[PDB]
Subunit: 501 residues, 4 copies
Amino acid sequence: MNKRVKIVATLGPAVEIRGGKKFGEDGYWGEKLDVEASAKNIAKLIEAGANTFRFNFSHGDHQEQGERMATVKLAEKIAGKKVGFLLDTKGPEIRTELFEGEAKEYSYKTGEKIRVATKQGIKSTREVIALNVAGALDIYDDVEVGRQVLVDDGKLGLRVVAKDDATREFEVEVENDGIIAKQKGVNIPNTKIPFPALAERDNDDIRFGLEQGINFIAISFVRTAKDVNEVRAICEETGNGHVQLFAKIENQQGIDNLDEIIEAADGIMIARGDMGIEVPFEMVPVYQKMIIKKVNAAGKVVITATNMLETMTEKPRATRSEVSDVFNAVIDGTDATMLSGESANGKYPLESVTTMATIDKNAQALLNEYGRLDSDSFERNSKTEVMASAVKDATSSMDIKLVVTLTKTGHTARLISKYRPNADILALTFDELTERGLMLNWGVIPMLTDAPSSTDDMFEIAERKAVEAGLVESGDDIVIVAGVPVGEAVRTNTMRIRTVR
Amino acid sequence: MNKRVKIVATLGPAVEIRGGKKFGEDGYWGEKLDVEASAKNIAKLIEAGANTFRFNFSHGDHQEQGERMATVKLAEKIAGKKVGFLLDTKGPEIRTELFEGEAKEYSYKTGEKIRVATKQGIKSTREVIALNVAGALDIYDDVEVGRQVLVDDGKLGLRVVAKDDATREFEVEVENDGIIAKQKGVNIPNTKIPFPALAERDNDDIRFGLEQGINFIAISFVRTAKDVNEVRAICEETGNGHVQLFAKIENQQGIDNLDEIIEAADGIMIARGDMGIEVPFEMVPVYQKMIIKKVNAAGKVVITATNMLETMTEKPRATRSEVSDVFNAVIDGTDATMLSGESANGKYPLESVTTMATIDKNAQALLNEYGRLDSDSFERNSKTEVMASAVKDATSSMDIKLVVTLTKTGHTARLISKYRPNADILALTFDELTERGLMLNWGVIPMLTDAPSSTDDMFEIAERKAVEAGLVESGDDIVIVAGVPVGEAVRTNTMRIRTVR
Amino acid sequence: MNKRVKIVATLGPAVEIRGGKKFGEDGYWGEKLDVEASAKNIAKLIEAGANTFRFNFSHGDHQEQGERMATVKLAEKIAGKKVGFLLDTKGPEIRTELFEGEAKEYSYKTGEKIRVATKQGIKSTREVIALNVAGALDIYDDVEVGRQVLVDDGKLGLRVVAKDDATREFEVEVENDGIIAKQKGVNIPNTKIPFPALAERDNDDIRFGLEQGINFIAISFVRTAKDVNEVRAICEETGNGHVQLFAKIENQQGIDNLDEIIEAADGIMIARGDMGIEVPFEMVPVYQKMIIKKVNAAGKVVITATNMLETMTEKPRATRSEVSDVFNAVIDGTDATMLSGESANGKYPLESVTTMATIDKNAQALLNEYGRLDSDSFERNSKTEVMASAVKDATSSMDIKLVVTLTKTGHTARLISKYRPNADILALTFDELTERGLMLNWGVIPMLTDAPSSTDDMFEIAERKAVEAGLVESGDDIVIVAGVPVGEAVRTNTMRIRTVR
Amino acid sequence: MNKRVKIVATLGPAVEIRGGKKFGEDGYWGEKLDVEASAKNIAKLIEAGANTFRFNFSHGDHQEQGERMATVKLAEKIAGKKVGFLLDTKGPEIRTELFEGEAKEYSYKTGEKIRVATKQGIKSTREVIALNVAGALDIYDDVEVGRQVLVDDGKLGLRVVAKDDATREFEVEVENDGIIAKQKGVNIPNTKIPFPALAERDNDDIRFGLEQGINFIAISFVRTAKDVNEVRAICEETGNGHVQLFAKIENQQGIDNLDEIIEAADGIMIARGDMGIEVPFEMVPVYQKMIIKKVNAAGKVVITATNMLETMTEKPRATRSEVSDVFNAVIDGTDATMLSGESANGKYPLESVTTMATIDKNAQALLNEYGRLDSDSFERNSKTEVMASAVKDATSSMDIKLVVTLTKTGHTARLISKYRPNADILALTFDELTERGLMLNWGVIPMLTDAPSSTDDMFEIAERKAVEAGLVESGDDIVIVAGVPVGEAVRTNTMRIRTVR
Ligand SMILES: O=P(O)(O)OC[C@H]1O[C@](O)(COP(=O)(O)O)[C@@H](O)[C@@H]1O
Ligand SMILES: O=P(O)(O)OC[C@H]1O[C@](O)(COP(=O)(O)O)[C@@H](O)[C@@H]1O
Ligand SMILES: [Mg+2]
Ligand SMILES: [Mg+2]
Ligand SMILES: [Mg+2]
Ligand SMILES: [Mg+2]
C-alpha cells in the first residue's frame, strides 16, 4: 500500500554525523558536520515515509538551519524523492535564564518559597528565577496573584502567592518536587502578554527561510487572523506567494478565533504540547477532533503534532498509548502526523518514521468503517469540487487503484484530497513549487511532468506516468481527471475510467 | 420543464372520427374510419405527452388493430414526434362474447335473473351471456354455486345461484346496476381453470403485431417465467429480438413468481384492474410499491396501470383520489403511468393525457423530498453502472439541466435512468428501433443521430443536438457521457461537465 | 386486528328509511322518517368501523340535523359502541340560484357568451346566472376580468371577459360543454371576498349544534386563526370548552396561515374538494403530506377528506386509484379518513365504511416499513411526553398487544397517539365527554370506567378492562401507564410491562 | 459530576510504606511493611476514583499478595468506600527468574553479549538470565537462532545469535539500553511453546485468592473457551460461583477464538502490552475497537489496559498521546480503564488515578457526540432488557440526574449499564458480593441496602438512598425501576419518573 497520511519529521542532531561520531557520543560537538553521511541518514527517513522536514527556529542559529536545509537537498537526490521544507517560527516563547556560576539546574521541594524576576538580561539564582521573555517584554503587570508559572513542559508548578512592586518579582510557592534547568520552556496560562502580531526575530527568521527556499511556514502561537496575515504580507512582498501558512493553535485565544484563522491560513498545525499546558489537558482531544473536521471542511491541511511516539526518543518500540494516538489521529481525519524530538533529538529517528508510517498505513484501511470525516455533508461550491465529488463516488462504486489528476496549480488535487477517496491520488503537475506544495495533502503523490500540448492524449500520459512510478499494473482500474482540451478548458472538466493495459 | 415520467395511452374509438362523426354521436358506428381526421386527433395526444400507444388485442380484430397502427404512423408525421408501439395480449383470460345482431351492450338492474353460457364459439344475447375462454376451455365444472362472476374490471357482479346441466349454463342474479358489453374482461375469483401455456390466439396476435412493427409486448396474466420465455422465443424466431417484453402482473401466481418473471422480462406492467379482483384489493398498494422497487433495482421499466384518472372518462376533472394516485405512483418510483378507458373509451382523451402530464411533472419535483427509490443502496455491477452513479452524483452536487449520452444500444441511457438523476436524459442513438425502445424509460428523451466517426468531437455533437432540440440554451450546465474514442472504447468511459456556448 | 386509523362518516338520506322506502325509491320523500329502522342502519356503520359521524350543515335545516343526531344516539345503543358527533359549518359558500320557471338546469357549449349577475335574491335565466352568495354579499368589485367562475365541483368553467358596471354583471365565455344546475357549488379562485370571520348563519348553526350535544366542529374555509378563535369564544361562553375545533383548509389563505391555524385549532381537516379547485389540483398531494406531518408534530388530529371512495356512491367496489388514495393517506400519517357522499347520499353506505376500514387496517401494518411520520425527530417537551416516548420504545423493542392509559382528560392518550406506537391504545377515562373527545385520535380505544381510588390497583384494573373488552388474552404482553398513586401523582409517572394471566 | 468509566488500579510497592520509608528511598527493602501507613495511602486512591484493585500474581509470593489484600480491606474502612478485588493470573507465560543474592535488577547497554538459560528452577545472574516457563517446560529446541527475546513489555530486546548445546543457553546480543528485573514478562515472538491447559501454579494462585476473598479473576493469555471454563470449574467447586472471570486477550489464538471466549467469560481485559508484541502492534487499535463493541453487545464488561498514562510512572504530567489514548478508550465504549506500573511501580500513584479520573469524566461528556457504541442496533432479548431500553429512551428525552434500580442479583443494573444511559446508575442491592461484583460496570454506583418487604414503598426507598448518598437533591428528576410488588414480580417491570422532594 502507499501511505496516504503524510509525515512531518523534525530534523536535528539525531541524524547528523560529526567526524564519524553519532549524537550522544563523547566529543560529538567537537567534530565538524559530515554533510554527506548526514544526508545519507536523512535519505533513509525519506525512503521510510517522511514527506516534509520541519526546521524548528526555536533551536539553532541561521547558519545551522541553512546548513541543515542544504543537507536535505542532497538527501532528496540520494532517495530519488522530493520532500517539503517547513519552517517553524520561535514565536512568543518564555524560557528560564542561564544560572549564576557553572550551575545548570537546581532541585526544589513542594512548599519551598522562591522568587521569579521579570527584569530582562539577568542570570537566575536558586532563590530568584529570571525569565528570557521573547522581545525582552516586561510581563510584571500581566500576571495576577493566583496564576501559575509552569516550567519544562508543565512539570514544575510555581504558584504566585504575592507580587513585590519594588523589585517586580513574583513571590511563588513550589507546588511539587522538581528541577528548574537553564533554557527550559515556561508557560503562564490564562495571562494576556501583549506580544506583537509578528516579532522582529520571527520576521528575520521567516525572511532567512524564504531566501533559502521553503514551501511551508508553521506560525507558533497564532492568536488571530492578524498573526497569519502579517506573515502572508512578507511572503507576497518577497515573491514567495506560493508558500503555504499553517497556523499553530496552542492557546485559548487561537481556539476562540479558529474560524477566522482557518479562513486566513492554508492549514492548521494542532500544537498539542503547548495546547495541553495552556488549556485543560483533558480538553485537547475534544479540540483535536473539532479542528480536524473544520479544516477538512475548508479543503485545507491539518497536521496533528507532539508526543505521538514520545517513548521512541529513548526506546526502539512505542507504547500502546502512542500507537493508539497515531491511529486515532488518522481515523479523526488528519492529513498529516508529525514527529518532533523523536526524529530531531532521539536515539531512534529512522525507527520513529518507520513505526509512524506502519501505523498510518494500517489506519487508512479502517477509514471506510470508522473514519470521522463525512464528505456527504459538504456543499460542492465549484465545478472542480463537483468533479472531486464524482471521483469519490467512482472510488466508492468499484475498486479504483489510483486517481490521476493533471493539475497546473494543484487545485484539483486538493479538492480530490478533501473528499478522501478510497484510492491514492497521483497529481501530475508542471513545476517543482506546485509539486512540493502538495506534499502534506492527504493521499497526494505529486509527480513533475512536461505540460501537455493541444495534441497530447492526457489519458495515455496519465496511464504511462502511473506505470513508470510503479503505482499500477495490467488490469488495474484508474480514474483520470483533466481539463480537456488544453487551451480551451478553463478547469478540470473530464473524468475517464480506464483499465491499465 | 420536461416530463420525466412516461405516459402509455390506450387507443380506441374515443380519438377516432368516422364519416365526420365523433365517438358518442348518433350513426357513428354506421360510418367508416376517417384516417386523416383520426391521425390529427392522435397527434394532439403525442404533443400532450403520450410517449407510447397501447393496442389492446382483447378488443376488435386484426384488421381494426392494423388500421389503428397505420393511423398512429400518420399521427407521428403530423406531430413530427415518434412514439412507442405496445401490443397488449389477451392471455389466459375470459372475455364476454359478441352479441347476436351486433348489439354492443345491454344494461341490467339489481335482482335480474339471467344466464351465463359455457359453450364456446357462440354469441351472447341479453338474457344469456356467452364467454370466450382462452384455449376454448369448458369451465362449467370449475364454477360452483355461490361463486361470483365479475364483468368489466368488477363493475358488474353476477352471483351463481344454480347450474342448469341441460344447457351447461350458470343461473345468476345481477348483484348491482350496470352494463355488460362485448369483449369485456370476466373474473371468477377463487376458481382454478387450466388455461394453456400459450393460447393459439395469442400466438396469432403476437405474430400479426410483429409483422406490423411494434416495440413492446405487454403479456397479460403472466403466471411464470415460461409465459415470458414463450413470447421471447417468437420474437427471436421472427428476427424481432429488439422487442421488449413487459410481464403484466395481475394474479397471485404472477406475484408468487415475481422474481423469476422480472429476470425473464424487460419490465413489469402493474395491471391493477385484474390484480385487485384476483388478490385482495387492499394488498394492491403493497404489491405496487414492492414491484416498483424491485424492477428499478433490476434496471428495468415499470408501468403503473388502470383507473389512474378513471373519472375523466365521463367528466372534465379528475377526483382528488385520482390525482393522489398518479402523484403517489410517481413518488413510489414508476417509470410510466398508463391511461386505459380515459384515452380509449372516454369523452376527454386529450384532457386526460394533459392532466396526467401536469400531475407527473409536479410530482417529479418532489422526488428529492419524498421519493421512495434509494439508488445509494445499489451494487454498481459494471463500469457503465459506475459511470451512471457518477452522473447521478454530479446532478446531486450542482444544477445540471440535461445529461447527454451517446448510446449505440441504449444500455448507458437505461443505467442513467435507473439512478433517477435530477435532470432530463438526452439519449443520442443511431437507429430507430433503439430510439423507440427507450421511450418508456424514466427521464429519457431519445433522439436519432448519425453514428460519430473517429474524427468527430462527440461533446460538440452532444451540445449541438441538445440546443437544436430546444432542451438547453447558452449558460446551462450539462453532463455528457460517451465511449471515447469511437473505434477503441469498449463502453461509456468518459464524463464531461460542459457550459453550453 | 383493531383499526387504528379513525373513520369520519357523513350522514344523510342514504341510511334513512321513510315509510318502508330506501333513498332513491319513488315516493321516498312522501313518507315520514322511520327513526328505529334508520338507527339500525346507522348501527351497522358503527359496527363496520365508523368512529365519528359528520353532520353537514351545508344541507338540511335544524329540524333535520337535530332528528339525525337523535337517530345516532339510538344507533350507539344498538351497536353497543359510542361515536363522536362532528358538526361541519356551511361557511362562505357561493351557489347557483333557482331558475325562472320549472327549469332545473340548462346545457351550454364552449364559446357561448353569457352573464353572471351579482345582485342577490333574484332567479337565474339561461343567459343570466344569478348567485346565492353567503350573507347576500355583493362580490362585483372583488372579481377582475380574466378570473374564472367554476360551477359544480369545477366541472363548468366561465371565463370573465368583461364587467358591465351598469347591471353589475360579469360577461363570461363558457370554456367547456357542461350543465349549470340550480343550487350547485361555485368557486372563483384567486379572489378575496370580504366574508366575515364568523357569519351570523354559522354562529346560529354552531349554537344549535352545541345545544344538541356535539364533540367536534369542522370550520369550513378557515383563512386565519381569527376564524378559529371566533368559534372557540362561543364554545367557552356556552360551557362547551370540551368541544374540539378542526380548521378546514380549503384555499390558499388557509395554506399560507397554516402554522397559526394549527396553533389555534385542535386539528385540521384537509378539505381536498374545495382545495383542489381553489389551488392547482396537482399541488393537493404536496399540501396533504406537509399538513399531516405538521399536525402530528403539534400532537393534534388530522382528517383526510373528500373523494376517497367516490366511485362507491354508485358501484359496490372502489377503483384502484381510490384504494391507493386511502392506503397512502394512512402511510402519510393521517389520524382519520373520511366519507362524504359515499356514506351520506350513495347506494352503498355500509359497503363504503367496510371497504375503508379494510384498507385502513391493511395500511396500518405497513407503517413500520413505509410510514412517513418520524417520532425520533420530536422534542419531548413535558414529562408526560417523555413517558409517551418510552411507551413507543417498549412497543419497538418487543411485541406489545396493547398500551393502556388511565387518563382523566385524555392528555396521556393524545401524547401516546402522537408517537404512533406499534400497538392499540386503550384509554380508560372517567367521563363521557373525554371518552367521545378521543374518538378521532389515531389508535385510541376510549373506554369509560369508574375513577380509581387511593386503594385500587390500577394495573389490575387495566388488565381486567382489557380482558373484558376482548382486546387481549392469556400470555399477551401489555404496557400500562398511570399517575401513581391517585391523590399524590400530578401526571402520568409510571410504566408497567405486564403479561395477561 | 460522577465518573461513569471505572478505574482498575494495580497495587504494588509504590503505595507501600516500609519502616516510615517511601518506595525509592535508601534502605526501603530492608524494612518491613507499615500496614496502617500503607492503608492510608491506598484509601487516597479509593477516594480519587479507583473502583477495583488488581493483585498481579506474576509478582511476589502468596504471603505478599495476602498481606496486600488485608491492607486494602483496612483501606476501605479508612475511606468508608468498598472496592472490587481482582486477581490477575500468571497463565501460559515466561517470566525472568529471581536473581542470585536478591539483586532485583541489572542495567545493560546495546551490544553487550549475555546468555539466557532454559534450565528450570534456577536463579539468574547478570550474565545468565534464567526463565520461569509456565509448566516448567524446556524451550531450548523451540527457539531458533535469529529469534528476538523481549523483556518487560518489549522494553529490552535480546537477539539470539548462537545456541550453546553444552548448557542449553541462548547466546544473545543486547539490542538497546535497558533493565532486566526479576519476575518480568518475556515474549519470544513467532515461537510455539506447548504450555499446559492450566498450570499447577495457576491452580494454586486461584485457590489462594478465592480463600482470601476476591470478586474478579483476570485470566492471562486466554487461548480458548476451555481456559475460562477450567477456572470457572474451580470457582463453582469451592462455592465461589459469584466470582466473575475476565479473559485477558493478548495473543493471536485469543483473538481467533474471541467469540467463544466472550460467551464463556463475564468480560474481557484488552491486555495491550502482550497483545502488541504477540500480534502486529499496528493491529492493536483495530482489535481494541472491535472487542469493546462485541463485549458491550453481549452485555458484559470490557477493561482497556496497559501504558494508558505510562509517562506518569516517572513524571507528574502525562503526554498528549496518553491523554488521547484514555479519552479514545472511553469514546470507543470501554467500561473501565486500567493503571499498571503507574499505580504499582511509579512516583505518582495518586496523581495517576486523579489524572485518569479527570480524563474519563471529560470524555463521558462527549459520548453523545462521538461515542462509537450504538444501542439502537441491539435486539432487546428479554423483558428486563426492554425496560433497560426504555430507561435509555427516558434519559435521551429529558435531563435525568440518576437512574435507580432495586436489583437482587445486579441483572437489571448490568442491562441498564449495557445501554449507556445519559445518567449515573444507582444499583441498590441486598448483599455485599452482588455490590462488589457491579464495581466495574460502566456508570454503576452499587450500594448495599435492606431487602424491601411487601409493605415498603420502593420508590421512596430509592429516593431516600439517592439523597443520603448525595447523588441528587430537591428538584432533580430521577428514573426508578423495580420489580413491583415484592413477592409477586418475576423481574423488573416498573419505571417511574420522580422529582426529588
Ligand atoms: O459496462 P457494461 O455494463 O459491462 O456494458 C458494456 C457494454 O455496453 C456497451 O458499451 C453498449 O453501451 P451503449 O449501448 O450505451 O453504447 C457495449 O459496447 C459493451 O459491451
Ligand atoms: O427479564 P430477564 O432477562 O428474563 O430476567 C429475569 C430474571 O431477572 C431477575 O429479575 C433478577 O433481576 P435483578 O437481579 O435485577 O433483580 C430474576 O428474578 C428473573 O428470573
Ligand atoms: Mg509549541
Ligand atoms: Mg388485466
Ligand atoms: Mg369544502
Ligand atoms: Mg499480559
